[PDB]
Structures are given as structure tokens and as C-alpha cells.
Amino acid sequence: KIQNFRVYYRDSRNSLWKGPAKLLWKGEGAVVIQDNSDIKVVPRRKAKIIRDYGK
Amino acid sequence: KIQNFRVYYRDSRNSLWKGPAKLLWKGEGAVVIQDNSDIKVVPRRKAKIIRDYGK
Secondary structure, eight states, X not given: OTTOOEEEEEOSSSSOEEEEEEEXXXXXXXXXXXXXXXXXXXXXXXXXXEOOSOO | OOSOOEEEXXXXXXXXXXXXXXXXXXXXXXXXXEETTEEEEEEGXXXXXXXXXXX
């Protein structure tokens, strides 16, 4: 969509940021994302939801 | 919600119907649900979204 949100996220195996992933849904303390076709569920604290704030 | 949507689903752990689960989100050919605190992602074909027809 136009908001063009991008999600950077953490996995439990590596203390590394992965992404940009597509934002599918937020709620119940989690963020549902999509990365390389895989649908993932990440806790809110492990997701950075980025947007272009300029336009 | 008076419709009282609940989800019956099939997962990869065991070959049968589980639920009722809470419906969190639908899209990208999947259904995001919550059951016994666990947030799960199930393909649409493996989810039965049920509602009250009597009341």
C-alpha cells in the first residue's frame, strides 16, 4: 500500500535484524509479517515498523 | 462482537481439527489465530471460520 510500511525484525536464533518485511497485521502483542514468502509472527518488542515520514 | 467468530483449524503437529480459536486476521492466503495463548498462522484451506446462526 501507499503507507509503504517496512518491518525490520529479530529472530530468536541470532540477535540480528532481518528485513525489510511486509507488515500484514499488528495486535495481541505481536506483529505478523511476510519475508521471502514466509509469514512470521514476531513479538512487538522485536519489530521495528518503519515508514517514509516525508510523503 | 455478537457474531462470535471462532476458528477450527488443522496444524502441522497433528492431523486433525483443533479449536475453538480466536480469529485475529485473514489475508495472504492465511488465517492468523490464537489458541491457548499461542498465535498461529494456518493456510485458508485449513481454517473453518464459524459464527452463531441461531441467535
